[PDB]
Design brief:
- Chains A, B: Pfam families: GST_C, GST_N.
- Chains A, B: Glutathione binds at residues 8, 44, 53-54, 66-67.
- 2 copies of one chain form a homodimer.
- The first copy, chain A, is 56% helix and 7% strand.
- Chain A is an alpha+beta fold.
- The first copy, chain A, folds into 2 domains: 1-80 and 190-221, Glutaredoxin; 81-189, Up-down Bundle (Glutathione S-transferase Yfyf (Class Pi), Chain A, domain 2).
- In chain A, strands 2-1-3-4 form a 4-stranded mixed sheet.
- In chain A, helix 1 links the parallel strand 1 (5-8) and strand 2.
- The first copy, chain A, is globular.
- The two termini of chain A are 32 Å apart.
- At the A-B interface, helix 3, helix 4 and helix 5 of A face helix 3, helix 4 and helix 5 of B.
- Bound molecules: S-benzyl-glutathione (2 copies).
- The site of one S-benzyl-glutathione has 11 residues of chain A, from loops.
Chain lengths: 221, 221
């Protein structure tokens, strides 16, 4: 209990951006998986989850419960949040555009089957016209290697993680965006991220039929 | 252009928590309203909106675009974000539970009319069982006047703003939560917030038939 213990089920879900921030920061974590609905209710009843939900992360003696509260703490603790407030204002504006798009991709497996391909067509229109041009534009304006202060931050890890999810959606979207392609390569070869991308890591896979089935059972949605 | 200029339409919407944070911090702002869809496209074409959307806030020479990026900057600039990172980790966990609930109430006027009362019944179940007990519990644990460091922060203004929206939904929900009732009274009598609650302020009203009509026209949803 010096190693962060991330409480969640065995899936990408809402824990994955934390798994990537901690691993890129070189921190080693421990995971306690929720296998059943009763695993989640025990957690609730013991007073571990402030709003009855997970992600939950035991770190520095706190039972931290919200995604954005978990990430903001880790990003500050490990110097991945910029040097001053004008610098983390640019990081929050970029990474919140990334969480808007990321929420669309995250929830797409739960979409009503009629809607599913209309939603997917809308997510590809947003990537082409709105989100990727915006980020191509900040990398093109300063011509530096990193999104914000010519120093690695959480905006780069949160953006590259998303570029991996968009590549699984359709590997053709990124092709007209050369500076994003370059940033993906670059952050993917950093030793901490490279370790994480390798075959034995705590990194999780796409949601399939059986994970979504387990997710509906545990979280009763 | 020393006064922040908040760009949005003339409604509560996603700008209202900024209107409350700035006003409680004693800052005076200016508002440029979007009246039409073309008012929004001019803004887009001039390169003011990074992801083609509003809220947008011109502050300290930045055209800041995301809600959480706007609020995090103002809250840091005006000392409303806690003293250290363990203190803003508690503020982010509390205020993100408040934004979950607040998103439900915000979007309720746009819900499909079949669904509307089932959604409203669900929001009242969440308030009674999940969100208000959680906050009653932190005020009861330390017995202090403020949610986080016995000093006013953004967690108190964001929570009281919500207690006003829940009171318009159903004035009976808060009654079994005495310490929240007390915090509402207390923050409402601070001179900056009191000024804002008074009849001539930049504070906005509930969404009605005609505001939602104007909102669908400007934002094409
Ligand atoms: N805003 C919260 C959201 C948390 C949340 O919704 N958690 C879900 C689990 S994450 C849900 C999920 C499942 C499948 C795919 C994506 C997300 C949960 O615990 N549900 C039980 C409850 O509400 O009582 C956060 O970011 O931490
Ligand atoms: N995550 C963004 C969300 C921004 C957003 O959705 N903005 C809307 C305006 S806010 C929408 C709204 C309307 C009525 C009631 C609640 C919210 C917008 O500009 N839409 C145009 C577009 O997407 O191209 C934020 O927090 O800033």
């Amino acid at each position: 209990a010096e190693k962060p213990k991330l409480h969640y089920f065995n899936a990408r879900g809402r824990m994955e951006s934390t798994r990537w921030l901690l691993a890129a920061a070189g921190v080693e974590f421990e995971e306690k998986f929720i296998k059943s609905a009763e695993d989640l209710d025990k957690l609730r009843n013991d007073g571990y989850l402030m709003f009855q939900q997970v992600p939950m992360v035991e770190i520095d003696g706190m039972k931290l419960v919200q995604t954005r509260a978990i990430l903001n703490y880790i990003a500050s603790k490990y110097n991945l949040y910029g040097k001053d407030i004008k610098e983390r204002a640019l990081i929050d504006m970029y990474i919140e555009g990334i969480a808007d798009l990321g929420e669309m991709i995250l929830l797409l497996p739960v979409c009503p089957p009629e809607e599913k391909d209309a939603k997917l067509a809308l997510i590809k229109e947003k990537i082409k016209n709105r989100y990727f041009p915006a980020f191509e534009k900040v990398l093109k304006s300063h011509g530096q290697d990193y999104l914000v202060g010519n120093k690695l931050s959480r905006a780069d890890i949160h953006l590259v993680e998303l570029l991996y999810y968009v590549e699984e959606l359709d590997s053709s979207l990124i092709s007209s965006f050369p500076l994003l392609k370059a940033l993906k390569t670059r952050i993917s070869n950093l030793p901490t991220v490279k370790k994480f991308l390798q075959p034995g890591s705590p990194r999780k896979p796409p949601m399939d039929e059986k994970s979504l089935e387990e997710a509906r059972k545990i979280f009763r949605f």
